[PDB]
């Protein structure tokens, strides 16, 4: 507080929130920045100068809380300041630029926070010499304090691979973080891989920014890069591999993703299909070349329950290979306990994380700081939406009025079956039937998401068009997928948690949700990203269409609000629709007669 | 309904009391300002000739397209006893009130005013520095007192008693505190001249004999008064309530010379903008307005963050919404504030969407809410989800026989205002327990 | 031929079944079920029932957002 | 530093309007606007699409043309699917063509253009036209090509021989054949094949096309024309009209053969003679009596007055915004300069100054 700040009569609910004690600079017209020192928040104008230069700086040193079109709510965090000094930045420069572009005097607590969040950059480093995690620090000053720490037990010494994660968490805790910047040009102990950036690949500007933020020194800075759906994370990884030119391993959490990224990699880089050996229960071949790649999903390394000897040979081979680069695509699942064996198993130097969503239910997402590193780059979602790099969606949330026909049983149903009982409302069937009619009238490919296989198959059978879920085999689901894509008999399909994420299905510009998870925001966000990567995200007059059929009179409204609040905070609003269009103009309605409603009620009473 | 309320009050005022009010030119000038354009034209035409007219000449002059409006004007004219329409020679012979006529004539000619426009001293000073500043001070004190945010300068005991008695900003004696009624929030929503007129209507209603016509004539000349001059301190009842409205901060009186501030002018007449707010689906407030009064009134129903020069920011919470709801403050009052605080870019976008949806379908199969329902209906859905029930308590008559008890005594009960509910087919209708004035009398027949 | 002293309430089948659950956890307050949109209740417990109904849709949603 | 750019832009603008001439300009006009409604105008590339904006701009063009020059008839033929379709005969009532264009609103633009067919039937429609009427056609075009049945050059020669001019407002860029049309029809001028750069430029171009055009000395047709002022009646009884054959309360009466009509400025249906009001003929007198430009006096020199002569406001003070009417020797503000030069058509300083 640069004032006396005598408490105002209107500042009672302003529990240290009345931010008028600051002496506002007369350059408030030009400068775009406020500071909120009560919570560390930052208030940023979208209509004053210096904001274009300050946007990347605020992303680097701060995190945004909320970014609508008019005012961006940012927040300096120690995580973001560590990311800033890891990119290469410092407290004094941050304070100087902040006072240069700030309308307001710089707060003492913020000054102290940025002073504290300055790391020993360059002091603590680790290298791998013949699959051995050598902790090579620049001084014995590091060795004294680290041996002063009880966990541990120029100059380089060994720390065990499972102990590497624990000691990385510990050194982050004592705020002595390690930078992992591989000198792949200087290191020739690893086999260099003759892969070249083909002229057929040219890079987007924000992707070039993402590379150069972690290629500022020419070394590969290890961390996270968060890019939206369809941004070209495969292209970014291909460019990083081609400019590293070493043995590289990338694991993604689907065998379909294994197939698709293997063909993407052999397409847009000069690595050879001989050098790429694909590992799965389809085939477990190995490449015998000095340099190349072996791809598998996380399952064929995590599992030890039912493993083949050829799988054992392959995992032995990858254990033997000292890789120079690792990318954990869809990094939201690898910090799970059966999945966080990556450092314990794979000897790889540079650790990059590419994913769409950097959020989850628990705090395992912050473990990537001592698993792979901080966020090296992020692309602004609404900026790419207006840039056409991702889509523009007219989301329409459908508040289906609850039928008492199903509510009478739903209220007296037990808890494990209440969910399946209120998913299956005949009014919801009626609304879905007219919505499918109306969007096939508009000529839009529609994908329907249900959390339950029986509800998915019942909706699919009432449509007369097939279903795909997690228990459907791969051959049947791809047959149904190609039937949907090319065959005009299959105009719409019925997808599930194999369709929510980790697939490339951007044709469906229309999406209707009949069910979802209880509170998993990431499933809903990935379902939105399924159509955010749509092909017609660039044409004029485009707005994608998202629909969520949710039953009234439940907790499902609060559930959907919880699942949607991340997208609302992103900028993907959820508009209110209760009275739909064309409710009786459709002649035939699914389970329209009350006898039909009681029929479906006792049909689902057979299970519930 | 300000002119409606004042006209209704003057119609409640009897004919000769009205004629007493029509005696003085300042009162006649203010009342002429109140009259609608047609009657204003009629009286300015007839005021300069002592020729009474029959109704037939006026009817022949009047174009029949606005005949309803003509009927409204002449209905006000007759019901105020400003007219003397008598069926002389079989024809409804039209006659203006003659005292009103001559006092208007003298006011227009600048003739005999008897200082009804004001017993003038004409010692003019600066008003922006003393009168406007003291006026803004006293009005700020009473305004934040009405808000409920703490302020030391309490109002007068007369207005304090009027608030205690009245249903405006209830000084609940069990709590000992002024409390925001729904009528209090109506007063908050009101325009400033509306607030002044409601205050004077309530004070005139409560005040009795203090001569009522003296208060009336003094109020009319006080509205007629001009800023920044000294004047003679007149009737003594007028003088003592003049000291009362001095304590309200309306006039800057040096205990005989008094200096009327700008509030008399606003009482007489009114005089990306300020007060324009950008709505947000994230409920964020982008106000193009700032005042400590603005923050004080926004504290009642909006969760705010900080105060900057014109940029008042915040986020509307459902806690703020239900804080408004639990005070008895109406969601219609809330949207009255909201729709009076809209912004140009968003209303242009709303009108563009309206014109887009006009060509597709007339109904559009959408709820009728012109303000963009992405943010606006979220409150309106919360508005419908706020009340969402109907409660009937007390007596109830049930199991009727046939509709002679519905189309004869319950259809008649629509004309007298005694039922709370009406259902012919259920053969029951609900009334309040205390509303049995004329319910158990003709229903027995 | 009867006229019992009750408080008529406009209702719904769903909120009426909630009223029935109110009767289940303490009975004989609500007098009789007229139709799907009408009910008759003890006039002494109308706002007790209203506040408990407020608790009922609180348990439905509660709008915490904390 | 924006005022220097505004000043040099105003200089480069005023270099074109330095020469103001009292050319003989056509009053008895004959304007045709053909419309193409093809696949090209289905592009939403300009918001909302080219078809919608040309519809709206044509509405405005009809209004402006009938307001400024009510002494002409207006015909519109649409182009669609390799056929040119007449939708609007030449008429004195703009409302007919307004309704036809409203019909064109709801229908769907599609097909390919044929300027040969379009201009041929435009020629045929322009065939029974009297000598004093100035036959001229506006053409809008969005394609870069034209499918045609036969030669265009014979049509060009015939159009030149029959004394009809054209002006092309192309959409995308220049088309060489359209340049050839404009040049050869327009005595070698290149001031008729115009390409917009945005919708505002299109608006300005339409406003430019509103104006009457000068005529050539060699194209001499100086003659008289018979004229008749009618008389309006306001009768109690409804009376049958000659034109639409229906009962009319009022209506003008024919000065010659004493019939009655329903609208003006129109020709008689019975004695077959044109009927106008003096207002209609005086409407173009600003074109007949043009206004000289007004000069800002320099800020360095001494000033006759420091506030505006006409609107009576203070002149603002770097440069001097005192636009001087040299014909009346009075300086004016920019607002008054704009209003007198565009909306008004007289100089009140020259009205006060006696001659
Ligand atoms: Mg699926
Ligand atoms: Zn006619
Ligand atoms: Zn004639
Ligand atoms: Zn001027
Ligand atoms: Zn002049």
The ligand that comes nearest to the alpha carbon of residue D249 is 2
The residue to which tokens 């029930």 are assigned: B389
Please provide the DSSP assignment of B378-442 as one string.
HHHHHHHHHH--EE--S-EE----SGGGTTTTTSTHHHHT--S--BTTTTBEE--SS--SSSTTT
Residue in A273, A564, A601, A263 with CA at minimum distance from that of residue A407: A601
Decide the pairing of beta strands D274-275 and D295-296.
Answer: unpaired
Please provide the DSSP assignment of B228-293 as one string.
S--B----HHHHHHHHHHHHTTSEEE----EEE-THHHHHHS----TT-EE--TT-EEEEE---HH
Please name the residue ranges forming H helices in A486-536. Answer: 521-532
Contacts of B232 (CB under 8 A, 6+ apart): B119, B120, B121, B256
The reply, when asked if residue A234 is annotated as ligand binding, is yes
- Burial class of residue A511 in the structure, from the number of CB atoms within 10 Å of its CB (0-12 exposed, 13-18 middle, 19+ buried): buried
Task: Give dist(CA D49, CA D44) in Å, integer.
Answer: 4
The answer to whether the beta carbons of residues A567 and A532 sit under 8 Å apart is: no
Task: Give dist(CA A263, CA A257) in Å, integer.
Answer: 10
Domain ranges in chain C?
1-66
CB burial of D49-62 (b: ≥16 within 10 Å; e: otherwise) equals bbbebbbebbbebb
Task: Give dist(CA A492, CA A513) in Å, integer.
Answer: 13
* CB atoms inside a 10 Å sphere around CB D342: 10
- Burial class of residue A341 in the structure, from the number of CB atoms within 10 Å of its CB (0-12 exposed, 13-18 middle, 19+ buried): middle
C7–B396: do the CB atoms touch at under 8 Å? yes
Contact A/B (≥3 CB pairs under 8 Å): yes
The answer to whether the beta carbons of residues B250 and B123 sit under 8 Å apart is: no
Residue in A455, A442, A449, A440 with CA at minimum distance from that of residue A489: A440
Contacts of D226 (CB under 8 A, 6+ apart): D273, D274
Establish how many alpha carbons lie within 13 A of residue B383's alpha carbon, considering only the half-sphere containing its beta carbon: 17
Residue in A120, A55, A109, A117 with CA at minimum distance from that of residue A84: A117
Task: Give dist(CA A337, CA D198) in Å, integer.
Answer: 60
Task: Give dist(CA A310, CA A317) in Å, integer.
Answer: 10
The number of residues making up chain D comes to 355
Phi-psi region of D185 (alpha: psi -120 to 50; beta: other; left: phi over 0): alpha
Distance from CA of A403 to the nearest CA of C (A): 9
Distance from CA of A581 to the nearest CA of B (A): 6
Contacts of B307 (CB under 8 A, 6+ apart): A18, A19, A20, B290, B292, B295
Q: Strand pairing partners for D84? A: D79
Chain C residues touching A411 at Cβ < 8 A: 14, 17-18, 21
The answer to whether the beta carbons of residues A11 and A20 sit under 8 Å apart is: no
How much of chain D is helix, strand and coil, in % rounded to 5?
30, 20, 50
3-state secondary structure of A463: helix
Q: Can you read off the two tokens belonging to residue A202?
A: 């040219």
Contact status of A3 with chain C (Cβ, < 8 Å) = no
Number of H helices, E strands in chain D: 11, 15
The answer to whether the beta carbons of residues A240 and A284 sit under 8 Å apart is: no
Q: Can you read off the two tokens belonging to residue A309?
A: 């000897």
Contact C/D (≥3 CB pairs under 8 Å): no
Q: Can you read off the two tokens belonging to residue A507?
A: 């044709």
The number of residues making up chain B comes to 445
- Reduced 3-state DSSP string for A176-238: CCCECEECCCCCCCCCECCCCCCCCCCCCHHHHHHHHHCCCCCCEECEEEECCCCCCHHHHHH
Q: Which helix (H) or strand (E) holds A43?
A: strand A41-45
The answer to whether the beta carbons of residues D55 and D12 sit under 8 Å apart is: no
* CB atoms inside a 10 Å sphere around CB C52: 18
Furthest-apart CA pair in chain B: how many Å?
A: 80
Q: Strand pairing partners for B53? A: B94
Cα-flanking dihedrals φ and ψ of residue B313, to 5°? Answer: -110, 165
Alpha-carbon distance values, A507 to A128, A469, A504, D272 (Å): 45, 19, 9, 67
CB burial of C5-37 (b: ≥16 within 10 Å; e: otherwise) equals ebbbbebbebbbbbbeebeeeeeebbbeebeee
Residue in D163, D190, D167 with CA at minimum distance from that of residue D33: D167
Residue in B236, B238, B217, B224 with CA at minimum distance from that of residue B20: B217
CB burial of A366-386 (b: ≥16 within 10 Å; e: otherwise) equals bbbbbbbbbbbbbbbbbebbe
Establish how many alpha carbons lie within 13 A of residue D355's alpha carbon, considering only the half-sphere containing its beta carbon: 5
Chain C residues touching A402 at Cβ < 8 A: 14
Contact status of C26 with chain A (Cβ, < 8 Å) = no
The answer to whether the beta carbons of residues A251 and A278 sit under 8 Å apart is: no
Task: Give dist(CA A531, CA A509) in Å, integer.
Answer: 6
Q: What is the resolution of this structure in A?
A: 3.7
Task: Give dist(CA B141, CA B148) in Å, integer.
Answer: 11
Number of H helices, E strands in chain B: 20, 14
Residue in A237, A278, A276 with CA at minimum distance from that of residue A255: A278
Contact status of A553 with chain C (Cβ, < 8 Å) = yes
- Chain A residue at shortest CA distance from C58: A555
The ligand that comes nearest to the alpha carbon of residue D348 is 5
The reply, when asked if residue A228 is annotated as ligand binding, is yes
Contact status of A411 with chain C (Cβ, < 8 Å) = yes
Cα-flanking dihedrals φ and ψ of residue A229, to 5°? Answer: -75, 130
The residue to which tokens 């400033």 are assigned: B192
Phi-psi region of A585 (alpha: psi -120 to 50; beta: other; left: phi over 0): alpha
A66–B149: do the CB atoms touch at under 8 Å? no
Phi-psi region of A457 (alpha: psi -120 to 50; beta: other; left: phi over 0): alpha
**Residue A424 CA, ligand 1 centroid: distance in Å:** 18
Report cis status (omega within 30 of 0) of the bond before D48: yes
The answer to whether the beta carbons of residues A326 and A250 sit under 8 Å apart is: yes
Task: Give dist(CA B118, CA B232) in Å, integer.
Answer: 8
Chain A residues touching C12 at Cβ < 8 A: 404
Q: Can you read off the two tokens belonging to residue A334?
A: 């690898």
Residues followed by a gap in chain C, C→N > 2.5 Å = none
The ligand that comes nearest to the alpha carbon of residue D263 is 2
The answer to whether the beta carbons of residues A220 and A211 sit under 8 Å apart is: no
- Burial class of residue A559 in the structure, from the number of CB atoms within 10 Å of its CB (0-12 exposed, 13-18 middle, 19+ buried): middle
Rg of chain A on CA atoms, in Å: 27
**Chain mean position to CA A88:** 25
Furthest-apart CA pair in chain D: how many Å?
A: 71
**Chain mean position to CA B300:** 22
The reply, when asked if residue A230 is annotated as ligand binding, is yes
* CB atoms inside a 10 Å sphere around CB D353: 13
Cα-flanking dihedrals φ and ψ of residue D257, to 5°? Answer: -105, 10
Residue in A248, A264, A234 with CA at minimum distance from that of residue A326: A248
Contact status of C14 with chain A (Cβ, < 8 Å) = yes
DSSP conformational letter for A369: G
Task: Give dist(CA A103, CA A25) in Å, integer.
Answer: 5
Contact status of A568 with chain C (Cβ, < 8 Å) = no
The residue to which tokens 């939206």 are assigned: A228
Task: Give dist(CA A426, CA B319) in Å, integer.
Answer: 35
Report cis status (omega within 30 of 0) of the bond before D265: yes
Alpha-carbon distance values, A408 to A412, A552, C13, C15 (Å): 7, 13, 8, 10
The number of residues making up chain A comes to 608
The residue to which tokens 């913020």 are assigned: A110
Please calculate the CA angle B91-B95-B101 and round it to the nearest 5 degrees.
Answer: 170
Q: Strand pairing partners for B414? A: none
DSSP conformational letter for D342: I
How much of chain C is helix, strand and coil, in % rounded to 5?
45, 20, 30
Contacts of A9 (CB under 8 A, 6+ apart): B144, B149, B150, B151, B296
- Burial class of residue B443 in the structure, from the number of CB atoms within 10 Å of its CB (0-12 exposed, 13-18 middle, 19+ buried): middle
Please name the residue ranges forming H helices in chain C. Answer: 13-25, 46-60
Task: Give dist(CA A370, CA A170) in Å, integer.
Answer: 9
Q: Most B CBs within 10 Å: which of A5, A8, A10, A568, as the mutation test of the B interface?
A: A10
Residue in A321, A351, A287, A342 with CA at minimum distance from that of residue A131: A321
Task: Give dist(CA A592, CA D302) in Å, integer.
Answer: 89
Interface residues from chain A to B (CB-CB < 8 Å):
8-10, 12-14, 17-20, 24, 28, 34, 36, 43, 66, 68, 70-71, 568-569, 573, 575-576, 578-582
Chain D residues touching A541 at Cβ < 8 A: 44, 48
DSSP conformational letter for A26: G
List the single residue in B318, B393, B426 with the smallest CB-CB distance to C7.
B393
* CB atoms inside a 10 Å sphere around CB B224: 20
The answer to whether the beta carbons of residues D85 and D78 sit under 8 Å apart is: yes
* CB atoms inside a 10 Å sphere around CB B218: 21
**Residue D293 CA, ligand 5 centroid: distance in Å:** 10
Return the axis-axis angle of helices A91-101 and A108-116, rounded to nearest 10°. Answer: 150
The answer to whether the beta carbons of residues B81 and B31 sit under 8 Å apart is: no
Phi-psi region of A40 (alpha: psi -120 to 50; beta: other; left: phi over 0): left
Task: Give dist(CA B276, CA B289) in Å, integer.
Answer: 7
Cα-flanking dihedrals φ and ψ of residue D45, to 5°? Answer: -60, -35
Please provide the DSSP assignment of D144-186 as one string.
S----SS-SHHHHHHHHHTT-EEEEEESSS--HHHHHHHHHHT
**Chain mean position to CA B2:** 4
Distance from CA of B138 to the nearest CA of C (A): 41
Contacts of D98 (CB under 8 A, 6+ apart): D59, D62
């Amino acid at each position: 507080i640069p004032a006396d700040f005598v408490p105002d009569s209107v500042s009672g609910m302003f529990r240290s929130h009345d931010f008028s004690y600051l002496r506002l600079r007369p350059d408030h017209a030009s400068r775009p920045l406020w500071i909120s020192p009560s919570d560390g928040r930052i208030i940023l104008e979208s209509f004053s100068p210096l904001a274009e230069q300050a946007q990347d700086f605020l992303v680097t040193i701060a995190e945004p809380i909320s970014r609508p079109s008019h005012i961006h709510e940012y927040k300096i965090t120690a995580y973001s300041l560590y990311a800033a000094v890891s990119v290469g930045l410092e407290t004094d420069d941050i304070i100087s630029v902040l006072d240069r572009l700030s309308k307001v005097p710089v707060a003492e607590s913020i000054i102290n926070f940025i002073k504290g969040a300055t790391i020993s950059y360059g002091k603590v480093k680790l290298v791998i010499k013949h699959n051995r995690y050598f902790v090579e620090t620049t001084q014995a000053d590091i060795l004294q304090m680290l041996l002063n720490d009880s966990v541990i037990g120029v100059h380089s010494f060994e720390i065990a691979n499972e102990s590497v994660e624990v000691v990385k968490k510990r050194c982050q805790e004592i705020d002595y973080p390690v930078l992992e910047e591989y000198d792949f040009r200087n290191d020739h102990r690893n086999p260099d891989l003759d892969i070249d950036l083909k002229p057929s690949t040219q890079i987007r500007p924000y992707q070039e920014k993402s590379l150069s933020k972690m290629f500022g020194n020419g070394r590969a800075r290890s961390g996270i890069i968060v890019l939206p759906c369809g941004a070209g994370k495969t292209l970014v990884g291909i460019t990083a591999a081609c400019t590293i030119k070493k043995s590289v391993i990338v694991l993604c959490t689907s065998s379909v993703s294994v197939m698709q990224w293997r063909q993407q990699f052999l397409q847009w880089c000069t690595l050879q299909p001989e050098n790429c050996a694909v590992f799965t229960s389809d085939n477990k071949e190995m490449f015998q070349t000095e340099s190349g790649l072996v791809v598998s999903t996380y399952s064929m390394v995590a599992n030890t329950r039912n493993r083949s000897h050829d799988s054992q040979k392959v995992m032995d081979f990858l254990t033997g290979r000292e890789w120079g680069f690792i990318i954990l695509d869809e990094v939201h699942v690898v910090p799970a306990a059966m999945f966080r064996r990556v450092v314990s198993t794979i000897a790889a130097h540079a650790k990059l994380g590419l994913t769409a969503t950097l959020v989850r239910e628990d705090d395992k997402i912050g473990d990537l700081n001592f698993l792979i590193g901080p966020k090296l780059y992020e692309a602004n979602w609404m900026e790419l939406s207006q840039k056409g790099h991702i889509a523009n969606v007219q989301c329409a949330e459908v508040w289906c009025p609850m039928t008492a026909e199903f509510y009478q049983e739903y209220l007296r149903e037990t808890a494990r079956k209440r969910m399946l009982l209120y998913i299956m409302n005949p009014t919801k069937f009626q609304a879905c039937q007219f919505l499918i009619q109306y969007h096939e009238r508009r000529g839009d490919k529609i994908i329907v998401f249900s959390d339950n296989v029986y509800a998915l198959q019942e909706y699919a059978l009432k449509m007369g068009k097939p279903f795909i879920y997690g228990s459907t085999p791969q051959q049947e689901r791809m047959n149904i997928l190609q039937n949907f894509q090319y065959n005009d008999q299959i105009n719409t399909i019925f997808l599930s948690k194999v369709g929510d994420t980790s697939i490339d299905l951007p044709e469906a510009t229309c999406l209707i949700q009949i069910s979802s998870h209880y509170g998993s925001r990431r499933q809903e966000a990935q379902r939105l990203g399924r159509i955010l990567r749509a092909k017609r995200r660039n044409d004029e007059g485009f707005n994608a269409f998202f629909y969520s059929l949710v039953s009234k009179d439940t907790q499902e409204m609060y559930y959907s609000t919880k699942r949607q609040a991340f997208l609302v905070d992103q900028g993907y609003a959820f508009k209110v629709i209760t009275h739909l269009h064309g409710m009786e103009n459709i002649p035939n309605l699914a389970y329209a007669s009350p006898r039909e409603r009681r029929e479906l009620l006792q049909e689902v009473l057979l299970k519930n | 309904s300000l002119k409606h309320s004042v006209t209704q009050y003057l119609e409640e005022i009897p004919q000769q009391v009205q004629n007493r009010l029509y005696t003085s030119p300042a009162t006649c000038l203010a009342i002429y300002r109140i009259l609608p354009p047609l009657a204003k034209f009629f009286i300015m035409a007839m005021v300069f000739n002592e020729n009474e007219v029959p109704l037939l000449d006026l009817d022949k002059w009047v174009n029949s397209n606005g005949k309803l409006q003509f009927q409204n004007a002449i209905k006000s004219m007759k019901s105020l006893h400003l007219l003397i329409p008598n069926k002389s020679s079989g024809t409804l012979m039209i006659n203006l009130n003659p005292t009103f006529k001559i006092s208007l004539r003298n006011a227009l000619t600048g003739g005999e005013v008897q200082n009804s426009f004001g017993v003038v001293v004409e010692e003019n000073v600066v008003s922006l520095d003393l009168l406007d500043e003291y006026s803004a001070n006293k009005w700020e004190t009473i305004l934040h007192f009405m808000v409920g945010t703490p302020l030391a300068k309490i109002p007068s005991e007369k207005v304090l008693n009027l608030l205690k008695h009245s249903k405006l900003m209830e000084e609940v004696n069990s709590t000992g505190e002024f409390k925001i009624t729904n009528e209090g929030f109506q007063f908050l929503l009101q325009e400033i001249n509306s607030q002044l007129w409601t205050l004077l209507l309530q004070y005139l209603k409560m005040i009795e004999t203090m001569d009522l016509v003296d208060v009336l004539h003094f109020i009319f000349m006080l509205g007629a008064l001009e800023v920044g001059k000294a004047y003679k301190i007149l009737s003594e009842t007028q003088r003592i309530m003049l000291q009362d409205m001095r304590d309200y901060g309306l006039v800057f009186q040096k205990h005989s010379i008094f200096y009327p501030t700008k509030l008399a002018l606003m009482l007489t007449s009114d005089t990306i903008p300020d007060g324009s707010l950008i709505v947000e689906t994230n409920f964020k407030i982008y106000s193009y307005s700032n005042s400590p009064l603005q923050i004080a009134v926004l504290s009642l129903f909006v969760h705010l963050k900080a105060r900057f020069v014109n940029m008042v920011l915040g986020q509307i919470t459902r806690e703020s919404i239900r804080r408004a709801l639990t005070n008895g403050i109406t969601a219609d009052q809330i949207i009255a504030y909201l729709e009076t605080h809209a912004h140009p870019q968003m209303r242009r976008l709303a009108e563009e969407k309206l014109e887009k949806k006009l060509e597709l379908d007339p109904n559009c199969k959408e709820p009728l809410q012109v303000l963009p329902p992405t943010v606006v209906d979220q409150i309106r859905l919360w508005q419908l989800e706020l009340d969402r029930v109907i409660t009937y308590e007390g007596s109830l008559y049930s199991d009727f026989e046939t509709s002679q008890e519905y189309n004869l005594l319950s259809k008649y009960a629509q004309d007298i205002g005694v039922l709370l509910w009406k259902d012919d087919k259920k053969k029951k209708f609900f009334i309040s327990k205390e509303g049995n004035s004329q319910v158990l009398d003709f229903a027995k027949r | 031929a009867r006229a019992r002293k009750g408080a008529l309430v406009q209702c719904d089948p769903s909120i009426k079944a909630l009223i029935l659950q109110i009767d289940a956890k303490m009975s004989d307050i609500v007098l009789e079920e007229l139709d799907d949109t009408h009910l008759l209740v003890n006039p002494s417990k109308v706002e007790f029932v209203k506040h408990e109904l407020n608790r009922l849709l609180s348990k439905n949603i509660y709008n915490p957002m904390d | 530093a924006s005022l220097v750019a505004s000043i040099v832009e105003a200089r480069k603008k005023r270099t074109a309007k330095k020469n103001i001439t009292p050319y003989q300009r056509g009053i008895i006009r004959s304007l045709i606007l053909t419309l193409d409604c093809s696949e090209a105008m289905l592009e939403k590339d300009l918001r909302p699409n080219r078809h919608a904006m040309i519809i709206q701009y044509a509405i405005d063009f009809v209004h402006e043309f009938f307001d400024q020059n009510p002494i002409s008839q207006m015909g519109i033929i649409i182009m669609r699917n390799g056929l040119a379709q007449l939708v609007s005969q030449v008429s004195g009532n703009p409302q007919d063509h307004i309704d036809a264009l409203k019909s064109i609103r709801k229908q769907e633009p599609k097909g390919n253009p044929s300027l040969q067919n379009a201009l041929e039937m435009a020629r045929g429609l322009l065939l029974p036209v009297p000598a004093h009427c100035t036959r001229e056609v506006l053409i809008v075009f969005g394609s870069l090509s034209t499918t045609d049945p036969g030669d265009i050059h014979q049509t060009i020669d015939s159009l030149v021989s029959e004394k009809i001019r054209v002006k092309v407002l192309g959409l995308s860029a220049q088309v060489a054949i359209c340049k050839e049309l404009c040049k050869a029809t327009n005595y070698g001028d290149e001031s008729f094949y115009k390409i917009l750069l945005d919708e505002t430029h299109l608006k300005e171009l339409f406003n430019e096309a509103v104006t009457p055009l000068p005529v050539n000395k060699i194209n001499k047709g100086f003659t008289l024309v018979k004229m008749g002022f009618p008389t309006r009646i306001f009768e109690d009884t409804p009376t049958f009209c000659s034109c639409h054959s229906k009962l009319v309360y009022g209506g003008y009466f024919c000065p010659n053969c004493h019939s009655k009509v329903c609208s003006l400025p129109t020709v008689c249906p019975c004695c077959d003679l044109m009927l106008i009001l003096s207002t209609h003929l005086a409407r173009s007198y600003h074109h007949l009596m043009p206004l000289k430009t007004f000069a800002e006096v320099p800020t360095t020199e001494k000033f006759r007055s420091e506030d505006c002569f006409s609107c009576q406001s203070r002149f603002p003070i770097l440069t001097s915004s005192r636009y001087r009417c040299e014909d009346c020797k009075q300086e004016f503000c920019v607002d008054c300069d704009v209003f007198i030069h565009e909306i008004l058509h007289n100089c009140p300083g020259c009205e006060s100054k006696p001659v």
